[PDB]
């Protein structure tokens, strides 16, 4: 159900 | 081959991404960075993509 942060890139 | 299974849509924000939405199987051709893989859909599109929305396949 809740999004997982989008990660940072390099 | 590694295939993955979107578990969330993606939009596809910055022009390498490889937009997806939720139950896209994707193949996985490369593993530059630990959080960004290289994918590719079952049209053939590629570009990157972010695992925490992605599932191994099975
Ligand atoms: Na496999
Ligand atoms: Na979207
Ligand atoms: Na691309």
């Known amino acids: 159900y809740e999004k997982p942060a989008l990660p940072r890139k390099r | ?58």
Not at chain 2, 1 to 30: M, Q, S, T
Not at chain 2, 43 to 56: D, F, H, N, Q
């Open chain 2, 1 to 58: 081959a590694e295939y993955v299974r979107a578990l969330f849509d993606f939009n596809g924000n910055d022009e390498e991404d490889l937009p997806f939405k939720k139950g896209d199987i994707l193949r996985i051709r490369d593993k530059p960075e630990e959080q960004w893989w290289n994918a590719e859909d079952s049209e053939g599109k590629r570009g990157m993509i972010p695992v925490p929305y992605v599932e191994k396949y099975r």
